Amino acid sequence: SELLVNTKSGKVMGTRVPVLSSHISAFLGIPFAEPPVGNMRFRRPEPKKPWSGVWNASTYPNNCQQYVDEQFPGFSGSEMWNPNREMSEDCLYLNIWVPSPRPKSTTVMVWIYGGGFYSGSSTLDVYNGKYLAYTEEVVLVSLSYRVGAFGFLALHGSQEAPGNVGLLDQRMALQWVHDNIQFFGGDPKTVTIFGESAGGASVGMHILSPGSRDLFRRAILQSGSPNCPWASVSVAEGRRRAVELGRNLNCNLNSDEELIHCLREKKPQELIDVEWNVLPFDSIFRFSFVPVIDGEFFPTSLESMLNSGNFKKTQILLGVNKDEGSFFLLYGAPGFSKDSESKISREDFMSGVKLSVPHANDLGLDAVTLQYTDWMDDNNGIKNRDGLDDIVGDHNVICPLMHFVNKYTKFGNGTYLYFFNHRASNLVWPEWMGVIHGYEIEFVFGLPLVKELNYTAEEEALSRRIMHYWATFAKTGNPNEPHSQESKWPLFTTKEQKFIDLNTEPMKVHQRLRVQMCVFWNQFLPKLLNAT
Amino acid sequence: SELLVNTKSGKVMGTRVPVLSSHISAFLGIPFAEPPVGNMRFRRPEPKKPWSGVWNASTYPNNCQQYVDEQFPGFSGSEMWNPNREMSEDCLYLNIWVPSPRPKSTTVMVWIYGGGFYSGSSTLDVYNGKYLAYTEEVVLVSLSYRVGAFGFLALHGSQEAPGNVGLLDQRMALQWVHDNIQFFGGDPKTVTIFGESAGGASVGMHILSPGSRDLFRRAILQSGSPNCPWASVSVAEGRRRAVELGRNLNCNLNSDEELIHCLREKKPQELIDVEWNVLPFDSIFRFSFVPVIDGEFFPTSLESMLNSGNFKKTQILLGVNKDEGSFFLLYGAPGFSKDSESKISREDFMSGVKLSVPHANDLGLDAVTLQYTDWMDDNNGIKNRDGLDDIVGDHNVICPLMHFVNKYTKFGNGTYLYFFNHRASNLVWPEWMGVIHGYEIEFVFGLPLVKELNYTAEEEALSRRIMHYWATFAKTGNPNEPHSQESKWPLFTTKEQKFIDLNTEPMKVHQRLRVQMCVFWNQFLPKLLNAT
Numbered sequence A, B: 001s002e003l004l005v006n007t008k009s010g011k012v013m014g015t016r017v018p019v020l021s022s023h024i025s026a027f028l029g030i031p032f033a034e035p036p037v038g039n040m041r042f043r044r045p046e047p048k049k050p051w052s053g054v055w056n057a058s059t060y061p062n063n064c065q066q067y068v069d070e071q072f073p074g075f076s077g078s079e080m081w082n083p084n085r086e087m088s089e090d091c092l093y094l095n096i097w098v099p100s101p102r103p104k105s106t107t108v109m110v111w112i113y114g115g116g117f118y119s120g121s122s123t124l125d126v127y128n129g130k131y132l133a134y135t136e137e138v139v140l141v142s143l144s145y146r147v148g149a150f151g152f153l154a155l156h157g158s159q160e161a162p163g164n165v166g167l168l169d170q171r172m173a174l175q176w177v178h179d180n181i182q183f184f185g186g187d188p189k190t191v192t193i194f195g196e197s198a199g200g201a202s203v204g205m206h207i208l209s210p211g212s213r214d215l216f217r218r219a220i221l222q223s224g225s226p227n228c229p230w231a232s233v234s235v236a237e238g239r240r241r242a243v244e245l246g247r248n249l250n251c252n253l254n255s256d257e258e259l260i261h262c263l264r265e266k267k268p269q270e271l272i273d274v275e276w277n278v279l280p281f282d283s284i285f286r287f288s289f290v291p292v293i294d295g296e297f298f299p300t301s302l303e304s305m306l307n308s309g310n311f312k313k314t315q316i317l318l319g320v321n322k323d324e325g326s327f328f329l330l331y332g333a334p335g336f337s338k339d340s341e342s343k344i345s346r347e348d349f350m351s352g353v354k355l356s357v358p359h360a361n362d363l364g365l366d367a368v369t370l371q372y373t374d375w376m377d378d379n380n381g382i383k384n385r386d387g388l389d390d391i392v393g394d395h396n397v398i399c400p401l402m403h404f405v406n407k408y409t410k411f412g413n414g415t416y417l418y419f420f421n422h423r424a425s426n427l428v429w430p431e432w433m434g435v436i437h438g439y440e441i442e443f444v445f446g447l448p449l450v451k452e453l454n455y456t457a458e459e460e461a462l463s464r465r466i467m468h469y470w471a472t473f474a475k476t477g478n479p480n481e482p483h484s485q486e487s488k489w490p491l492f493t494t495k496e497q498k499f500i501d502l503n504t505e506p507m508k509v510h511q512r513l514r515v516q517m518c519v520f521w522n523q524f525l526p527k528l529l530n531a532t
């Protein structure tokens, strides 16, 4: 039967799922690691022991333990990101959508969800892989990994809580895909990993880490880069935060052993309840437990790895959204609200800048403010609001990606860059937030092809184009259809630095995406902060 | 007779001079101080002893000893600034143009020439006061003062060479005007001092200095401000330069007495020949001997005087030209030439920045470069050339004047600000230099009314308008004709910061002249340089 697949780990039984008037097979909740529970909490993952009999893979698995957004109860804009299955530490599973009839050896795409490294689920409606698998005829896999303290608590020097275990969870899933996807009709030689935000940072981290490079062929990064200021911490900062978490739970702090044992006796929600108390600064776009530059998963500093070409050389397709910072200003910066136009006073602007670049001294804060203030009209509320939106997006997402892009292209084998700037007609968030962080995902996953979701005919066309760009790239290392008549997405080169806009209008090519601001963020400001 | 005037210093005999088909009286070369020669070189000026008989004031006097421009022999663009009379240390004289018939008590305007404090003459053709005196019916005076080491060599603590004596020369001339102008038909209660560049800085210095304030009524500053970075030095830097001058002439440096005596035995040209060797940095727009913050002529730092309102409160009219920096880039920055379009490479741009802000550390240089580089088109030669032109003009002239303007207006009784941006049709300098430092002077002095000088009919109209604005302001403290139908030059206020463009097009009002760049130069950069 089509729904029965024998893998190196044992037999698995899937389910037939309807998709746009047709059908495909889905193998949901396949285990790829032993549950990281009890004494294994904080530890590197262990491979799942093979099983006898047939594993029932007809339903989604549990989501990993995580902080749950309750800022807007019942609001779909925020709840579409919350776990939609019961949470459990026993959450290391992957999902596979397979075209029907089962292919023999086709293109494989593995999705890595985002969520600031503290949240996320592979089972969200926006990550439903059936549309992409069906429309592009690819085997679509979505993995999972531990987030928050469970996946990133780091006490460097200890083997009980070394840090980066969430990344190792992702690596283990990629190993399982490499070893077994052939049985589902996928070609292990042609695996593209793709993810957004923390998932995009993760993809870049696998490109960098020597121990992950051989597990995939190509990569797609959406609104995320390994060098993002929020994506990693030093082992000293990781240690300080782990100790501070312990201090919040009245743990014995005499030794790592004492600390870890105490943290292991706590129920999941006890760690989550105090997780946010360990941040070193009053800030926005900063998360507690994230990857650590350990000297193992990451051999040396990310910057030196990027500068020396110490990373997997292959093709990459990546990009950013127009208003990456709005989600974060709404949730923490003074003056912003979901139900107002959020025009920002000069003082709230100043407060926002301080929260946005928490690590900056006063000279640094002045540099940023000057760079984003129109002094001919400084009390303009809309300009202050949009300026902050740009500060947050440029600093945390766009400029780090542009730095990654330029460093990468020097050694890589092919780069395609995009600027997604279409605001969905059915967006439930207010207009001031614009093209929000995370909102290109629904187009990548084909949601607009579903009539009941209320997208326009051009948005469905945009979705189909993006899906075919992503899949063709996964398949060939080039998003363009060979011998096609359609407009060509040009290669991003060190010299011309071309990129295309991604929206419902006829393709348009540009060059040097936000160079003015990124020279400020990537070259000048760090020089200023390092000198003063 | 109309050409005979009895003053408190003795009788003076002038000459009748033709002016635009009519005539007026001119009293040229009237002495206002004893010749500052021999043992009086470097000393404060002494008032001229009264004379018996009649002083022949029919011809221009000698010009003060100064460096002479030989960069373009025979070229009128540069030679129109060079002394046009024999040079001599016996050069403290003033000139007066009086309408005919002699008025009884009319508006007085006293001109203070510029020249970077190291050069300048009251006898230049562009400073001919007959047109303005005739057309506006004002008594026009042009004074003179020692420049270079002769007027500004400063060994603070010494009475033989205290510094600032060139400013005291100007003050003595203003005292003579106050005491005697009534005999020429001028009203001592209504004296307006006006000057350009170093002369404009001088005017602002008299506004600041307690010992000069009572000598005039109102002020006009053209492309110059007392706080300009090149207009003054500390007593320590003044001393170092004086000692270095001595070192260049093989002087005994054991004491001030030994140094000064040696400097006094040298012929004028010997000091001038090594004058430029004392600058502390490789730079442009920096001059050797300038005013010193001595604690006497200037009670405290210029900034604290400006901040506390420690200055004469009255009305001021001032402004800048569009391309203040071009003259200086042509003469010293790599890549610029008089006969080429001077498109600047990225490297010459960098070299220019270093010469333009000689006091800046590397972080400072990077800040400036970033602020003026279009990173989307950084190898554009015209943009690099124009960017440097703006760097030089903003830093040395425009932003210091804007800082002066805003500090002044808070305590003053009326401010009128202009932006002169008309390029004369008959300019002999190349097009790339634009509206050059010093080139609004010919319009202020009415040269365009002289047919043989080849100006257009609209330029003559512009000249007449400017002359009437200046004179009406001198007379009333307001450039606008009361009850006129013409467009009104609005008052510059702390709140609205309005200014007008000055050109052949219908008046246009704007606000916050070059605010973006001036916040950089007046607030951010000094904060950066002071911290790092």
Ligand SMILES: COc1ccc2c3c1O[C@H]1C[C@@H](O)C=C[C@@]31CCN(CCCCCCN1C(=O)c3ccccc3S1(=O)=O)C2
Pocket: A067, A069, A071, A081, A113, A114, A115, A116, A117, A119, A120, A196, A197, A198, A199, A276, A284, A285, A286, A327, A328, A331, A332, A437, A438
């Ligand atoms: C690094 O990028 C991200 C960081 C956080 C999240 C996402 C994300 O990318 C997006 C798209 C996708 O990748 C998944 C989740 C998304 C959207 C949903 N949500 C958006 C709200 C994030 C901003 C508020 C975060 N919070 C705090 O900073 C904070 C501080 C103290 C206590 C509680 C909180 S919080 O959870 O409200 C969480």
Ligand SMILES: COc1ccc2c3c1O[C@H]1C[C@@H](O)C=C[C@@]31CCN(CCCCCCN1C(=O)c3ccccc3S1(=O)=O)C2
Pocket: B067, B069, B071, B081, B113, B114, B115, B116, B117, B119, B120, B196, B197, B198, B199, B276, B284, B285, B286, B327, B328, B331, B332, B437, B438
């Ligand atoms: C502070 O503003 C200024 C500084 C210098 C001058 C003027 C001026 O404003 C204008 C208009 C008016 O006020 C009178 C003279 C003006 C035009 C004529 N000339 C223009 C040429 C100035 C630029 C070159 C100065 N030189 C040097 O920096 C240098 C260095 C070493 C040796 C020799 C020289 S230099 O004389 O060629 C001299």
Ligand SMILES: *[C@@H]1O[C@H](CO)[C@@H](O[C@@H]2O[C@H](CO)[C@@H](O)[C@H](O)[C@H]2NC(C)=O)[C@H](O)[C@H]1NC(C)=O
Pocket: A412, A413, A414
């Ligand atoms: C990606 O790598 C391939 C193979 O290494 C590059 O193709 C080679 O290009 C070189 C230089 O032009 C030729 O000498 C070889 O014959 C090519 N090999 C093959 C098998 O095609 C390709 O140019 C690279 N692409 C980019 C954008 O770097």
Ligand SMILES: *[C@@H]1O[C@H](CO)[C@@H](O[C@@H]2O[C@H](CO)[C@@H](O)[C@H](O)[C@H]2NC(C)=O)[C@H](O)[C@H]1NC(C)=O
Pocket: B412, B413, B414
């Ligand atoms: C310049 O100073 C004059 C006189 O000090 C100001 O005129 C006075 O304005 C105050 C306040 O409006 C009135 O109470 C007086 O009656 C006015 N005095 C006279 C004699 O007019 C004038 O407003 C000031 N101008 C500016 C721009 O500051």
Ligand SMILES: *[C@@H]1O[C@H](CO)[C@@H](O)[C@H](O)[C@H]1NC(C)=O
Pocket: A056, A057, A058, A059
């Ligand atoms: C597979 O497991 C799910 C768990 O709820 C169950 O509903 C479904 O009927 C099961 N099917 C088989 C054949 O075990």
Ligand SMILES: *[C@@H]1O[C@H](CO)[C@@H](O)[C@H](O)[C@H]1NC(C)=O
Pocket: B056, B057, B058, B059
């Ligand atoms: C005034 O002095 C000048 C000096 O050259 C002379 O030419 C002129 O004739 C003199 N006039 C009288 C009356 O002395």
